[PDB]
Design a protein around this ligand. Structure first.
Ligand SMILES: *[C@H](O)[C@H](C[C@@H]1CCNC1=O)NC(=O)[C@@H](NC(=O)OCc1ccccc1)[C@H](C)OC(C)(C)C
Ligand SMILES: *[C@H](O)[C@H](C[C@@H]1CCNC1=O)NC(=O)[C@@H](NC(=O)OCc1ccccc1)[C@H](C)OC(C)(C)C
Lengths: 306, 306
């Protein structure tokens, strides 16, 4: 038993991280087969990042302008091209550690593992959720750009995120691996800010199921409610509406605990209206929304990966 | 910026995990050079685990009784011996992925990364603290025994923990890699339970410094206090006493924020006596004690590992 915020083993991604230096900018790249993927703003300078024309900026670059280092081994760049907000640097060596992978874009509400990196060297790993406002509450310092987010399914690494920038509230914004930003953000210096967020309702319910599975039951109750009457309370507390599909997804959890989904909603209603009255749930004094139904099932059952 | 509970990259440990099967017991082992380390209760059966005599149990075993599988490759056992509560299974192949490593025993208050494993296959990674009562609040299901805890310093993996069992409150107990249990626990079936815990005071202060570094300042105040008057409040709220050495360790954090250590104590005093009044710190509604001063400095500065 136990429930902890848990990331995927990072080893398969660690073997793909490299360092990309261009000019006086250094960041991380992702080396898969004979391509290194990195944020395009590596070609920018300090005055460029005011209103750049990345298309103009890249035509003025050379292959030899890109210093790519895999550990203490230099990689020779033999081609470059831009895909939306990422660069694709073709190198003369396929990464022998290329795992099976896919480039997948995730939905707000979904989680992934972030391998934070500096100078091509992995620093730490942690779990993140894509917020409804397409930001992520990560931990990123100067030099972390190009760190990727990912999920692992058996042996296949689905890359979903590449880090680009920090917004002024301290949250983080980036792209999928095809270079398309999550949310209404751009890789140039503007006054852009996060935008209004909401609580991921289905994840809170999944986490309440994780709690019940792990012996925290004090928030349970005999009440019930309709989906409609629940969604009126959700909208008042800035929670996302709950759909019938969310109820279906919660089915396995409901059946394992014997607590019907709408019963758990009634529990969440009371939690939202009364607070916790000094108690905790899974060691938290807040309702947690960064665990998906899949995350709970995975951890309260025990899946692995080769 | 940002502050998230962050584990070390797990890749170096992933390449050491294997599966050890003996009889109808299967668990994880740690393969370093030509030795596989695993919990000794792999030699036990269901009736054995009532009051075993592991010494008697092992003399009746053969090398061929131990099925060790590294991925889809079998490892041939050529010797076995017991070190306290761990087995040492000598195999005919050195692990070519053996990182530089050390076996280190940690102190309550210190943190480490756990690579949770099932059937020799890594499942997830997360950060844990050794509680004052020598338990860890982990996430462990049937088959996770032999999963290890570790820290990484540049390229060297200091293994500190090997998982053995779950206590009835849902917390976890294990050994250092020399087979010596953390705390007053045994690898046989008794009514043993966790014992009284306390809050790691120095870690809470380090986390309050992480908050200030990240822009949460509402809990700051102009008050101060003596170390003595603080320790009277700590003892009332079941906090560990704060020593002058803890103050010294907090020096770098104090100097970077400009908040003297004893000023932060005065802030913690008020937090303990008044609560948070509906506010949060680093996204928590509780005072967090599972980040060491080193963890905060590492994350609020950005160290990496090759
Ligand atoms: C890339 O390594 C860098 C990562 C951020 C630095 C701090 N935390 C990060 O996530 N990205 C940038 O520096 C971008 N700018 C940016 O994040 O500005 C806000 C900021 C906050 C705190 C410290 C520094 C910066 C880049 C340079 O800017 C564009 C993406 C618009 C080109
Ligand atoms: C080894 O894989 C196993 C891991 C625990 C199972 C559940 N969570 C764990 O951490 N260790 C054991 O099964 C030990 N017993 C034990 O933990 O009993 C309590 C328990 C709680 C919940 C589910 C199952 C068991 C071993 C078998 O017992 C001795 C170490 C005393 C021999």
């Amino acid at each position: 038993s136990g429930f902890r915020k848990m990331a995927f083993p990072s080893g398969k991604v660690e073997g793909c991280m490299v360092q990309v230096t261009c000019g006086t900018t250094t960041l991380n790249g992702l080396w898969l087969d004979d391509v290194v993927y990195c944020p395009r703003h590596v070609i920018c300078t300090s005055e460029d990042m005011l209103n750049p024309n990345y298309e103009d900026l890249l035509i003025r670059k050379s292959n030899h302008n890109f210093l790519v280092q895999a550990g203490n081994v230099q990689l020779r760049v033999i081609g470059h091209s831009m895909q939306n907000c990422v660069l694709k640097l073709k190198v003369d060596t396929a990464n022998p550690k290329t795992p099976k992978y896919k480039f997948v874009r995730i939905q707000p509400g979904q989680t992934f593992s972030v391998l934070a990196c500096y100078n091509g060297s992995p620093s730490g790993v942690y779990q993140c959720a894509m917020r409804p406002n397409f930001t992520i509450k990560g931990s990123f310092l100067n030099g972390s750009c190009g760190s990727v987010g990912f999920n692992i399914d058996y042996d296949c690494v689905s890359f979903c995120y590449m880090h680009h920038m920090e917004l002024p509230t301290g949250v983080h914004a980036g792209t999928d691996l095809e270079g398309n930003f999550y949310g209404p953000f751009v890789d140039r210096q503007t006054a852009q800010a996060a935008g209004t967020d909401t609580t991921i309702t289905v994840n809170v319910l999944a986490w309440l199921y994780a709690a019940v599975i792990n012996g925290d039951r004090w928030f349970l109750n005999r009440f019930t409610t309709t989906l409609n009457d629940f969604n009126l309370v959700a909208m008042k507390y800035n929670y996302e509406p709950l759909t019938q599909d969310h109820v279906d997804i919660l089915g396995p959890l409901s059946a394992q605990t014997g607590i019907a989904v709408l019963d758990m909603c009634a529990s969440l209603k009371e939690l939202l209206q009364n607070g916790m009255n000094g108690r905790t749930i899974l060691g938290s004094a807040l309702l947690e929304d960064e665990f998906t139904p899949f995350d709970v099932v995975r951890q309260c059952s025990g899946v692995t990966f080769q």
